[PDB]
Design a protein around this motif. Sequence first.
Motif, PDB file in Angstrom:
ATOM      1  N   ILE A  68       0.863  -1.228   0.000  1.00  0.00           N
ATOM      2  CA  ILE A  68       0.000   0.000   0.000  1.00  0.00           C
ATOM      3  C   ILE A  68       0.887   1.263   0.000  1.00  0.00           C
ATOM      4  O   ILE A  68       0.476   2.360  -0.476  1.00  0.00           O
ATOM      5  CB  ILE A  68      -0.964   0.005   1.203  1.00  0.00           C
ATOM      6  CG1 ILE A  68      -2.105   1.019   0.962  1.00  0.00           C
ATOM      7  CG2 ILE A  68      -0.176   0.259   2.506  1.00  0.00           C
ATOM      8  CD1 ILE A  68      -3.156   1.065   2.021  1.00  0.00           C
ATOM      9  N   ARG A 351      -5.138  -3.673  -0.969  1.00  0.00           N
ATOM     10  CA  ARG A 351      -5.428  -2.691   0.095  1.00  0.00           C
ATOM     11  C   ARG A 351      -5.601  -1.295  -0.480  1.00  0.00           C
ATOM     12  O   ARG A 351      -5.025  -0.924  -1.510  1.00  0.00           O
ATOM     13  CB  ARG A 351      -4.299  -2.728   1.113  1.00  0.00           C
ATOM     14  CG  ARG A 351      -4.204  -4.052   1.829  1.00  0.00           C
ATOM     15  CD  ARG A 351      -3.409  -3.801   3.085  1.00  0.00           C
ATOM     16  NE  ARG A 351      -3.699  -4.968   3.882  1.00  0.00           N
ATOM     17  CZ  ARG A 351      -4.224  -4.998   5.074  1.00  0.00           C
ATOM     18  NH1 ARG A 351      -4.740  -3.918   5.658  1.00  0.00           N
ATOM     19  NH2 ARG A 351      -4.233  -6.156   5.681  1.00  0.00           N
ATOM     20  N   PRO A 352      -6.426  -0.427   0.157  1.00  0.00           N
ATOM     21  CA  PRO A 352      -7.120  -0.740   1.397  1.00  0.00           C
ATOM     22  C   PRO A 352      -8.498  -1.360   1.229  1.00  0.00           C
ATOM     23  O   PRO A 352      -9.066  -1.814   2.227  1.00  0.00           O
ATOM     24  CB  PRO A 352      -7.306   0.649   2.024  1.00  0.00           C
ATOM     25  CG  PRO A 352      -7.442   1.593   0.845  1.00  0.00           C
ATOM     26  CD  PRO A 352      -6.514   0.991  -0.201  1.00  0.00           C
ATOM     27  N   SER A 355      -8.954  -5.871   2.165  1.00  0.00           N
ATOM     28  CA  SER A 355      -7.885  -5.993   3.128  1.00  0.00           C
ATOM     29  C   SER A 355      -7.653  -7.445   3.549  1.00  0.00           C
ATOM     30  O   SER A 355      -6.904  -7.661   4.494  1.00  0.00           O
ATOM     31  CB  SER A 355      -8.143  -5.118   4.317  1.00  0.00           C
ATOM     32  OG  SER A 355      -9.314  -5.617   4.905  1.00  0.00           O
ATOM     33  N   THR A 360      -1.003  -4.266  -2.302  1.00  0.00           N
ATOM     34  CA  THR A 360      -1.734  -3.370  -3.181  1.00  0.00           C
ATOM     35  C   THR A 360      -1.089  -3.412  -4.568  1.00  0.00           C
ATOM     36  O   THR A 360       0.104  -3.283  -4.629  1.00  0.00           O
ATOM     37  CB  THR A 360      -1.736  -1.914  -2.698  1.00  0.00           C
ATOM     38  OG1 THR A 360      -2.363  -1.806  -1.417  1.00  0.00           O
ATOM     39  CG2 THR A 360      -2.436  -1.016  -3.699  1.00  0.00           C
TER      40      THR A 360
END
Lengths: 389, 389, 389, 389
Positions: A68, A351-352, A355, A360
């Motif tokens: 992320i 992500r987010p 989750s 990501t």
Amino acid sequence: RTFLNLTKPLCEVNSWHILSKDNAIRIGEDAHILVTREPYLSCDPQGCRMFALSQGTTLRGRHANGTIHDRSPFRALISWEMGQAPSPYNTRVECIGWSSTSCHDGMSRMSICMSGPNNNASAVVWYGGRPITEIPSWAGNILRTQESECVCHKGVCPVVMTDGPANNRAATKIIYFKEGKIQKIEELAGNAQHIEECSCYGAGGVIKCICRDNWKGANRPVITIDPEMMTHTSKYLCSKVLTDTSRPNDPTNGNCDAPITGGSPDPGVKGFAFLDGENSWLGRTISKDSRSGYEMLKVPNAETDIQSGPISNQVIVNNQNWSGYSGAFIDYWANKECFNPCFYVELIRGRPKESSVLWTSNSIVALCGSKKRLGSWSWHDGAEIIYFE
Amino acid sequence: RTFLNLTKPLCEVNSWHILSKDNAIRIGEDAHILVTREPYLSCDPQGCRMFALSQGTTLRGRHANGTIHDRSPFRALISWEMGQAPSPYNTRVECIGWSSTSCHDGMSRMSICMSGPNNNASAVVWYGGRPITEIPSWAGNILRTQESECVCHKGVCPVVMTDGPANNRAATKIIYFKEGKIQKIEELAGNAQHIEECSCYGAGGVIKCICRDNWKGANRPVITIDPEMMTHTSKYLCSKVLTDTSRPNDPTNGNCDAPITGGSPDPGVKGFAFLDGENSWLGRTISKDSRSGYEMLKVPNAETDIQSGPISNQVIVNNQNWSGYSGAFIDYWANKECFNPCFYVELIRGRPKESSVLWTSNSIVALCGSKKRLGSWSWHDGAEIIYFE
Amino acid sequence: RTFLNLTKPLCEVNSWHILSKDNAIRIGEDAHILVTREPYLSCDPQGCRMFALSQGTTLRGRHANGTIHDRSPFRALISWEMGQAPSPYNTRVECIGWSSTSCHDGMSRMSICMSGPNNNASAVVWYGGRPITEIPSWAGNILRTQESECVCHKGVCPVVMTDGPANNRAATKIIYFKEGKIQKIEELAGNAQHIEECSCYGAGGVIKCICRDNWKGANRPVITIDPEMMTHTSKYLCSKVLTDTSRPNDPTNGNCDAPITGGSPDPGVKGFAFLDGENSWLGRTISKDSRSGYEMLKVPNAETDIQSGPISNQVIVNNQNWSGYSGAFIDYWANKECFNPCFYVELIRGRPKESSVLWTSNSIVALCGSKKRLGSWSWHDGAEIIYFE
Amino acid sequence: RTFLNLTKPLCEVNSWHILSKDNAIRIGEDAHILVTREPYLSCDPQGCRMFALSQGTTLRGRHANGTIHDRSPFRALISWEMGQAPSPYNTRVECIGWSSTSCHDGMSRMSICMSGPNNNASAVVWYGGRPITEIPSWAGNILRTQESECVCHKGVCPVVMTDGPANNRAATKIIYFKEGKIQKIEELAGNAQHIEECSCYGAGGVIKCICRDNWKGANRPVITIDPEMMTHTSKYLCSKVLTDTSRPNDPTNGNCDAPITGGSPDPGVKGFAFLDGENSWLGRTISKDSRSGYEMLKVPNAETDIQSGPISNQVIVNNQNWSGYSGAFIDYWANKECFNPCFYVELIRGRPKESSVLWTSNSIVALCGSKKRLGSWSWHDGAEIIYFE
Ligand SMILES: *[C@@H]1O[C@H](CO)[C@@H](O[C@@H]2O[C@H](CO)[C@@H](O[C@@H]3O[C@H](CO[C@H]4O[C@H](CO[C@H]5O[C@H](CO)[C@@H](O)[C@H](O)[C@@H]5O)[C@@H](O)[C@H](O[C@H]5O[C@H](CO)[C@@H](O)[C@H](O)[C@@H]5O)[C@@H]4O)[C@@H](O)[C@H](O[C@H]4O[C@H](CO)[C@@H](O)[C@H](O)[C@@H]4O)[C@@H]3O)[C@H](O)[C@H]2NC(C)=O)[C@H](O)[C@H]1NC(C)=O
Ligand SMILES: *[C@@H]1O[C@H](CO)[C@@H](O[C@@H]2O[C@H](CO)[C@@H](O[C@@H]3O[C@H](CO[C@H]4O[C@H](CO[C@H]5O[C@H](CO)[C@@H](O)[C@H](O)[C@@H]5O)[C@@H](O)[C@H](O[C@H]5O[C@H](CO)[C@@H](O)[C@H](O)[C@@H]5O)[C@@H]4O)[C@@H](O)[C@H](O)[C@@H]3O)[C@H](O)[C@H]2NC(C)=O)[C@H](O)[C@H]1NC(C)=O
Ligand SMILES: *[C@@H]1O[C@H](CO)[C@@H](O[C@@H]2O[C@H](CO)[C@@H](O[C@@H]3O[C@H](CO[C@H]4O[C@H](CO[C@H]5O[C@H](CO)[C@@H](O)[C@H](O)[C@@H]5O)[C@@H](O)[C@H](O[C@H]5O[C@H](CO)[C@@H](O)[C@H](O)[C@@H]5O)[C@@H]4O)[C@@H](O)[C@H](O)[C@@H]3O)[C@H](O)[C@H]2NC(C)=O)[C@H](O)[C@H]1NC(C)=O
Ligand SMILES: *[C@@H]1O[C@H](CO)[C@@H](O[C@@H]2O[C@H](CO)[C@@H](O[C@@H]3O[C@H](CO[C@H]4O[C@H](CO[C@H]5O[C@H](CO)[C@@H](O)[C@H](O)[C@@H]5O)[C@@H](O)[C@H](O[C@H]5O[C@H](CO)[C@@H](O)[C@H](O)[C@@H]5O)[C@@H]4O)[C@@H](O)[C@H](O)[C@@H]3O)[C@H](O)[C@H]2NC(C)=O)[C@H](O)[C@H]1NC(C)=O
Ligand SMILES: *[C@@H]1O[C@H](CO)[C@@H](O[C@@H]2O[C@H](CO)[C@@H](O)[C@H](O)[C@H]2NC(C)=O)[C@H](O)[C@H]1NC(C)=O
Ligand SMILES: *[C@@H]1O[C@H](CO)[C@@H](O[C@@H]2O[C@H](CO)[C@@H](O)[C@H](O)[C@H]2NC(C)=O)[C@H](O)[C@H]1NC(C)=O
Ligand SMILES: CC(=O)N[C@H]1[C@H]([C@H](O)[C@H](O)CO)OC(C(=O)O)=C[C@@H]1O
Ligand SMILES: CC(=O)N[C@H]1[C@H]([C@H](O)[C@H](O)CO)OC(C(=O)O)=C[C@@H]1O
Ligand SMILES: CC(=O)N[C@H]1[C@H]([C@H](O)[C@H](O)CO)OC(C(=O)O)=C[C@@H]1O
Ligand SMILES: CC(=O)N[C@H]1[C@H]([C@H](O)[C@H](O)CO)OC(C(=O)O)=C[C@@H]1O
Ligand SMILES: *[C@@H]1O[C@H](CO)[C@@H](O)[C@H](O)[C@H]1NC(C)=O
Ligand SMILES: *[C@@H]1O[C@H](CO)[C@@H](O)[C@H](O)[C@H]1NC(C)=O
Ligand SMILES: *[C@@H]1O[C@H](CO)[C@@H](O)[C@H](O)[C@H]1NC(C)=O
Ligand SMILES: [Ca+2]
Ligand SMILES: [Ca+2]
Ligand SMILES: [Ca+2]
Ligand SMILES: [Ca+2]
Ligand SMILES: [Ca+2]
């Protein structure tokens, strides 16, 4: 080979045809695909390429954990053959860093990457695969740039950069390059109050950059650049059709010279528009709140008319699927008498919003204009997140 | 480089020699090989390439689950160096979609892919790697094309497309392209009642397409195209040797001008034939019911004589092994005084015939004519399905 | 760019320098490396490449089970950049089959593969990447060829092929190709009683092929070809230094014109020698019984003197490690006034000698001559079989 | 298209910008990345490539076990596109062995690799991808060379090699090559008392090689080579700023003409410096004891002034992260009036400092000079060793 001159008008666009899709996350479930974000495409005399910021790990790798995060010493701008997915095996490293732009001037490719810590970042400017220029941070707060292609005219490629707060007035500059050397630096002027992540294209001697106001506006700022005089103006998209995310409901009228505020919970996303009088198209997420769905709306005179609304629409990604960033590019070297708009949508997975996974990443879809009335469907990412649990 | 002209006759063929075999399923049990179907080959001045519609997942990937489905937003036409297996690392995306054709005109390659929902599909026609033309569905029901190569003459490359029902009268067109631009469109004429998946080749200024009647006939339609006048005729293969699948037993006489019905349980499969008077060869599955086995039958005057039968045979894939689609291609740029017939067989593994796995994919085998009397063996896929359980 | 001619003399060789090693089994323990056997190298104006017969599976794949078998429809001749290991991603399919040869004539490369059932095999002959000629079995028993490079002179590339029993008189022919076309076929003449798997090289306008007598002899047959006359002669290596495996102890005297029988348990292995008067080197396994070790012996006048023994040695692979086939090649396009001998050794791993795994494959090492007196060490495969258990 | 001339002066350097980083260990946690050590970079008229000594195994492979060991028959010099990580799929094998150098002369690349047993090693010198020359060990004790790029002037490329003890006086030579052929050999002269692993660059017709004294000095020797006369001198870096590892505290004065001794526990590491009067930069590990951290120090007149100390510094790798070898290279074909200093740092992971894994490998970071005052951050390897446990 010659320098690209932006002599041609935009092509008429009534609908959008599929250009490319890399299916990166589906493939990367098993094959060795790099984690990425902030993708784009850029073309040259031979064709078009995909670009993105690697996270320096594969998707199924243990290092995908924590991706992320936007900025690390392990990110780089990579390019690859359009339509392939980005693996360690088929990707060219353009430059090292965590914010980029790239464009071809007709002769060679310029690529720019920022790297370094938040308070002391720098750009390195590459041309023809060699570093040419370096630019230190001027405001000590995440020097950063477009995350989609720049545009060139007679060898001059303007690039919009910002340094300063994400959530307050920042210091934006337009830097005009030629063969990777600085020809001129301008401070942002005009009515745009905050500028990030400009999506730019050229037509009829004019570059237009449609950007992200991360401070106030849910309407997108627009920078209009004269690449010969190396001057610009800025304002907002006039149209009441708001195209940032998050955004409030579209009001009764837009505002050409000031931000339309509101929306929750997020202050912005990179996006784009093509602005050509009646021939004007605005992209946006379908959700007003979240980076969900993606639609193209034909909004005649969106650039000049605060009352302008949609006359047609094309769903690119349905609102049951994740989108992300979007940007403009054009194949300026197509065998056409006009420059045909293209765009891409970043399809963020993980992500987010998802989750159940530690990572990501994204995949890419790209479309270009058609004069015809083509049918459409949703080009969502198409990975099953449960397979990654 | 120059435009290909179909000036040469077909070579005499007495037997078939092995050209290529990718062993994709065997290799893909461990390496990262894309799930495919609807493969073919197509050549150009430099050599020959394999083509197929990817499903946008690897074979061992979790996303291979459900790849029996023919149409998704995750499919694309991919090409690769003849003989390699299709990986994410060695494959060129030609265009996006779930039905394709491709051919080289001697200067550049044209590739066409259809994509979209059933009721609103479109084709995008690419030339030299750039998108040229878009074509919306005319009948709102799975606009679709050959699934093997097209053929060009003096820069004109006719393509057969159908839009409409699989199980009833549909709207077939012949679209004549030059550098990816439409020169002419014809509605299907003549006595063929339903046209899909044409397998086409050129000789002495004539293109012949041998297709799939999915509605009625177990005999294959034949379209004869004049690429200079851009006109065509259609009928059925005359021979009593029925070559679609499923089919009934071969009758005492074929029918040049009407479908011969019967066979179960499947309405059709893509196939091909080379039709050159005494020098005529018909491919078909060995099984009359199923896509099992594959045989070449030399059937003198199959194109003209309802009583024509086989005078020789070559087993390509034994009837203990799965086959699939088959199609024509020729290396029109070979250093010979005649054009040598070539064909492929798609060797489909997995669903529905092998339901102990969740996926459907294929490998390829290709062979070309020989004037010699070559021995032969079965070129089956060669993977062990138990290894995928 | 011209046809190669073989007028230059062989270089003086006093020791052997390392050219390449691909470490394919070590790498393939984890990476996607194809199962192979019967490797070689061959060069062209641009450099040198590795070649081998793939088994159409990776080493770690489940389909590696059973790869001891020599002949299947899943084998092909593959080539790759020298030094790399052979993966599905970096290998070119030269032709399809289970016996091969290849050579460059200075203009293009000819590659020949045999395939099919034992009783009905055929060769396909490729030139410049295109199929040119087909050759049916003439004796109905595993039509087969060199498994290392051919050699070309002024366009003419002789190839030695055998069809017939492994354990009895067979029908050997020398076929002379130009641009993949047959110029002349000759039945084997002279005193060699059985010919397989010739290792061939050119010097001073003469091609010498050092072969495997699988029938009787532990001495190696030598065929001498004149590529301008397109004629040959045959006999055996005169030296008492016996170089087949299995073989008896070296006797007092060799035999120029008859097989020396004996040795247990195996009737032969492919090997090579360079025969140039005082400048003559013989390779062989170190073990007289098994394909263990590999040594080069300088044996002045090995070609002519039954009493000739070694004056120097270089161990290539120590006798604690597995070897395999060995063969000749030369970089005929080197910038030297002489043709420098090179050879390779196939390092066979797995069955039948290492029966704790289900597969058989190999790696490669290649060396070329030096006039210097270089030190040496063993270039064994280097994989730990335990890791594959 | 012409031989490189070292006519240009060095560029002014005030800070260092990021050029490349391959994140090999991060990527190689999941992807098929080869185990390496002793990396470097070298450029040519087209671009710059990464180089290293492979261990002939992937990082996740079971054969990674034991890769701390420096010399084996499974090592090779490999090169690859700058910025990618080294896989079996994207790497060119330059030569076989366990010590190397490589440089381009403007026309073609020379690559040299030593291999063989300690007491009888040999070098093979390659040019344009063909083996040219072999050089046997002259002192019977690990014949070895630079482990970074050589430099060429008017076709002549000097190379520094050593044979003899690591811990006592050895026999170093300067061998001057052209097109891979020995032009001249010199025995090392001057005041350097031991020479290993020279890092060399050219400017103004002079090549300077900054080396490792493994016997006595924690100051680094400097060899100055005239590639036109093919002569050299040697001494030590004058500066009190000691730049080997391990080293004692920097003394009050350095010594131009003799080693400054001390330090514990290790006798040396490869390193580099750029020496151009005021414009002089020294790299070293931050730790005086271990290969930990990496800093650049601007030390005016370091080559001539025993009192010279640092006026600027830039942390390249923080002292909480592992470094390794470091070396010089320049893109001599850049479009600039001066030659811009570049360097790399080898980021060693695994044994002996991280003993929870069985392997030893590295990743690469590379930086070039900037005249600007750029901000900096640590470019450490970035892998989590826990993921490999
Ligand atoms: C080296 O390999 C080569 C390469 O393959 C091989 O050469 C072949 O040799 C055989 C003879 O051994 C040749 O076979 C001939 O083929 C003729 C045509 O056969 C096809 O058509 C037949 C009729 O089909 C129609 O009618 C029937 C009802 O009658 C109907 O069911 C069908 O649907 C269709 O309407 C058909 O019966 C025949 O079936 C055979 O082959 C198929 C595969 O296609 C297989 O599935 C079947 O089980 C069956 O085996 C086939 O489909 C045929 O007319 C001809 O018959 C005359 O010659 C034979 C003697 O050979 C007489 O016994 C017979 O009475 C006839 O006078 C014969 O069967 C084939 O053409 C050669 N191929 C080539 C390319 O040259 C070599 O044999 C190999 N060498 C070795 C030692 O292995
Ligand atoms: C084959 O494919 C063709 C290609 O897609 C397709 O052609 C489409 O046909 C449809 C149906 O006729 C046409 O629809 C027309 O579109 C215009 C404009 O629509 C857009 O804008 C309006 C107004 O939005 C603003 O105002 C409202 C309320 O004040 C706000 O909510 C909004 O934020 C704006 O402020 C909007 O209401 C529309 O909403 C639709 O679409 C979105 C996604 O874009 C959905 O999320 C939403 O639920 C809703 O469905 C839309 O955004 C409209 O004004 C006309 O009345 C008419 O609806 C398409 O324009 C046309 N597209 C093209 C490219 O031609 C064919 O229909 C298809 N054939 C078949 C058989 O399927
Ligand atoms: C630095 O490197 C140099 C090169 O790498 C290296 O130079 C080598 O130096 C040695 C002397 O030290 C030279 O050895 C000489 O070799 C010749 C020929 O030996 C070979 O042939 C004989 C005879 O074989 C025949 O007869 C026997 C007995 O009846 C039969 O068994 C056999 O089957 C044949 O019919 C043979 O005995 C030798 O056997 C040795 O080598 C083999 C491997 O080939 C082993 O398996 C075997 O057990 C034994 O070790 C041999 O095969 C010999 O006649 C001379 O008297 C002398 O021994 C090398 O030729 C020379 N090589 C080169 C390339 O220059 C240096 O030694 C090295 N420095 C180091 C390591 O410090
Ligand atoms: C944006 O990033 C810029 C780029 O990094 C940065 O610009 C830097 O700013 C700093 C702070 O102003 C400058 O520091 C100055 O450096 C010189 C050079 O110092 C170096 O050498 C001295 C002396 O070393 C010798 O003497 C001691 C005994 O006293 C011995 O230990 C040693 O072995 C030598 O014999 C040394 O003391 C310094 O130590 C520092 O740096 C090292 C790493 O190199 C650390 O390990 C150590 O703990 C300590 O931090 C150093 O090695 C010095 O004389 C000045 O007094 C001043 O310190 C940088 O030069 C300057 N760099 C460049 C390239 O311009 C900006 O600061 C940054 N902006 C922000 C906001 O972060
Ligand atoms: C390797 O191949 C052999 C040959 O196919 C396999 O042996 C068969 O295994 C099945 C299932 O256990 C047995 O019932 C058969 O009796 C065996 N056939 C033969 C010819 O022996 C073997 O299982 C394969 N091994 C692996 C691990 O895949
Ligand atoms: C890593 O390699 C070492 C060195 O080969 C292995 O240690 C040997 O293991 C064998 C088999 O257990 C023992 O019989 C030897 O005595 C060991 N030798 C040494 C030098 O320790 C070790 O097994 C390997 N580790 C892994 C996980 O492969
Ligand atoms: C250089 C950088 O960090 N850019 C990041 C950008 C930035 O945080 C915002 O534009 C405020 O400045 O936002 C996002 C985002 O997904 O919203 C991702 C980018 O990686
Ligand atoms: C475009 C499309 O869906 N083509 C599909 C085709 C089609 O259903 C039939 O030709 C009826 O129109 O059939 C098959 C099949 O295995 O039979 C696979 C194709 O993917
Ligand atoms: C075409 C073919 O089968 N060649 C095989 C060859 C052959 O069996 C022998 O030369 C007797 O003819 O032997 C071997 C072998 O390892 O010994 C392997 C080859 O694959
Ligand atoms: C050829 C060779 O073995 N070079 C090795 C070198 C050498 O041991 C030292 O320079 C003393 O001679 O040291 C190191 C090291 O990490 O220190 C690694 C090299 O692989
Ligand atoms: C395959 O897909 C079906 C349909 O989505 C799903 O419910 C099932 O769990 C999947 N199987 C596997 C093993 O992933
Ligand atoms: C052989 O090739 C050489 C080098 O190309 C050439 O100069 C010579 O004429 C050739 N000789 C013959 C007889 O072809
Ligand atoms: C390089 O050196 C050559 C050979 O001495 C000289 O003639 C030439 O002028 C030089 N060229 C460049 C551009 O450095
Ligand atoms: Ca905003
Ligand atoms: Ca039918
Ligand atoms: Ca024998
Ligand atoms: Ca893998
Ligand atoms: Ca030291």
